[PDB]
Amino acid sequence: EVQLVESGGGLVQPGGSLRLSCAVSGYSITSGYSWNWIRQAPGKGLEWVASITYDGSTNYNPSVKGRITISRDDSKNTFYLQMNSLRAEDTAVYYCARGSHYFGHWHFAVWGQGTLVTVSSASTKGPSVFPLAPSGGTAALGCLVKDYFPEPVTVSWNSGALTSGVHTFPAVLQSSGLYSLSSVVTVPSSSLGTQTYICNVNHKPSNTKVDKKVEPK
Amino acid sequence: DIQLTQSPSSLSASVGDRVTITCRASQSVDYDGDSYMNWYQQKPGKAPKLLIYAASYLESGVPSRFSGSGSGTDFTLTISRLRPEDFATYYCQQSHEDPYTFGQGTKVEIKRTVAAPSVFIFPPSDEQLKSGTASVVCLLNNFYPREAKVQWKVDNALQSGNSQESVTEQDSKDSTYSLSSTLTLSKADYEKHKVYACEVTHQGLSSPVTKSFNRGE
């Protein structure tokens, strides 16, 4: 397996509203479970914010109570979170999580992957993608993903066939208010002439998808 | 609310060590003979994963090196023999009553022998220079411990204020870190100077290591 897939994350303006969805693998039956939203502000711990059960009972954490609604559409195996009057403290990765029973109580056995909500009035900007060209037996190369907003960017190498030696660094917030990150890989310097090295850069907020060939020199 | 306090907040332990972390609840989480404390493991960039429910029961498929014990207010999570992939933040969480609450997390880092970094320097790409800015990148790869100093030098002059650093989370396989430092200058200022160097200081190095290039080969 069952999968929980969140969507609706992204940029929200302060005071605006948030509408997230969690879609559950359709083969799954949701009646024996609780359905939860749990969020994590960057660098912080986990905060449970809402739950719903099969009979429609909702619970909300008073930390957000009053501007939060959890709802369900079983005909799509989907649960929803709406939050209004967003403020800075609402910037977080929001997780969907499914509770299983332990003697009438719940534990969070299955989690979605989380989606980032950024409360900001700034404008989305796609990155530029520049090569870090190779220039003993190991050489380093990479891609610089520069000047984007908001997070996140994902980077893979050769469509995911290249995983060992890969280091994708945390983004840095630059003084412009835009992020930049690099992703690098070390490879045998023997293969610099035969092998192709392509970094697959994805900035979904700007619909930026770049596959940059990094050649030597 | 039930407040959960984890101790220690962070710890470093060698591969093979027994690791015990504690969680103290501000009131009993017992109900009718069972203790409603759960433990999760959260690796960087990933959703939390349930390890232990009801204080002592292992979620199926969780490795047997993980165990939990406790009752009332006091709970422990033990890793009987730490593996390098156990680098993570571990959270306790009470299911006794709404709102469900989490401890602040215990960050478990892996201790290992000191390794000097391997250093690489990357000139700005021609594609970026055409756009009007220069990013010079210094890579420090696969070192331990995390602490390191990068000093940028331009025609031998020590820079400050014009660089940002970012460091990877500890590697799940070899327990090392990597660091990238970016020096950012305008195209005009970049082409006013010849020698670009980064000088690296680290416990594994008895004297600093400098990588450099001369602009325009």
Residue numbers in the entry:
A (entry chain H): 1 to 135, 141 to 222
B (entry chain L): 1 to 217
From the article:
Immunoglobulin E (IgE) plays a central role in the allergic response, in which cross-linking of allergen by Fc∊RI-bound IgE triggers mast cell and basophil degranulation and the release of inflammatory mediators. Omalizumab is a clinically approved anti-IgE monoclonal antibody that binds to free IgE, also with high affinity, preventing its interaction with Fc∊RI. Instead, the Fab alone selectively crystallized in different crystal forms, but their structures revealed intermolecular Fab/Fab interactions that were clearly strong enough to disrupt the Fab/IgE-Fc complexes. Mutations were therefore designed to disrupt two recurring packing interactions observed in the omalizumab Fab crystal structures without interfering with the ability of the omalizumab Fab to recognize IgE-Fc; this led to the successful crystallization and subsequent structure determination of the Fab/IgE-Fc complex.
